[PDB]
Amino acid sequence: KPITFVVLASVMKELSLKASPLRSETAEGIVVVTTWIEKILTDLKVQHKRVPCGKEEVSLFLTAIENSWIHLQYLFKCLINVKKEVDDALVEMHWVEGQNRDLMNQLCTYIRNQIFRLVAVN
């Protein structure tokens, strides 16, 4: 029952350019996006590994840590799929293990937010 968000085929094009401005047309669109999610996660010192996936997607398995303390610690687990849907990229995130399922939305909203900061490279 996964959270999703599209990356538009133009946002991909801009992510490719950022991945190599001085060259062109190197790698698939979903692959480029995935390696930008991989950049975003390592920067958070989130652990992740690419896992076997389907023919028309790339998958990250990731392990983040959460802390639940009192009155303003634990490990949670997610599968990110980056699948080519229509012309654009569909990003699915599946909650696998952990306490607060709503931390996925926090991580997903963050990642997708991080993507669009990168694309404002204008």
Swiss-Prot record:
Residues 74-122 are annotated as: VCR 2. Residues 1-72 are annotated as: VCR 1. The modification Phosphoserine is found at residue 20. It is found in: Nucleus; Cytoplasm. Belongs to the methyltransferase superfamily. METTL16/RlmF family. The VCR (vertebrate conserved) regions bind the first hairpin of MAT2A mRNAs. The VCR regions interact with the internal stem-loop within U6 snRNAs, inducing the conformational rearrangement of the A43-containing region of U6 snRNA, thereby modifying the RNA structure to become suitable for productive catalysis by the methyltransferase region. Interacts with MEPCE. Interacts with LARP7. RNA N6-methyltransferase that methylates adenosine residues at the N(6) position of a subset of RNAs and is involved in S-adenosyl-L-methionine homeostasis by regulating expression of MAT2A transcripts. Able to N6-methylate a subset of mRNAs and U6 small nuclear RNAs (U6 snRNAs). In contrast to the METTL3-METTL14 heterodimer, only able to methylate a limited number of RNAs: requires both a 5'UACAGAGAA-3' nonamer sequence and a specific RNA structure. This is RNA N(6)-adenosine-methyltransferase METTL16. The chain holds residues 310 to 562 of 562 of the full protein.
